[PDB]
Amino acid sequence: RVKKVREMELIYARAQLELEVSKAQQLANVEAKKFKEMTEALGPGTIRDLA
Amino acid sequence: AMSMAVESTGNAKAEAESRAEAARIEGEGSVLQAKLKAQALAIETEAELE
What does its UniProt record remark on the domains (chain B)? Predict the structure, then answer.
């Protein structure tokens, strides 16, 4: 019991925690690309001048 | 005196051996009760695993 419940726990735990990191990757990709489009068309020197 | 020795032997001997040889029964009870609960709990747990 303590082996086969707790090892199916390991395998599902994998299937769920590469999952949470996949969520993190995708949400952070959108954050990334939409700061990139933000700054690049806002202006490379505009951000310097405004600050 | 060796008379009262034999009554004392018989009494304490009988009481103690009755308790121990009953503990034999609770022991074999533990033996096959563990054996039965083994597969019983095994099939509950392997039925809740799926």
Answer: MVP 3 mediates interaction with PTEN. MVP 4 mediates interaction with PARP4.
Method: cryo-EM
Judged by DSSP in three states, B41 sits in helix
For helices B2-49 and A4-42, what crossing angle results, to 10°?
40
Resolution (A): 7.9
- Please tell me the distance from the alpha carbon of residue A41 to that of residue A47, in angstroms, as a whole number: 11
CA distance A3 to B45: 12
CA-nearest residue to A6 within chain B is B49
- Measured distance CA(B28)–CA(B21) in Å, rounded: 11
Measured between beta carbons, which residues in chain B are less than 8 angstroms from residue A4? 46, 49
Type of residue numbered B34: A
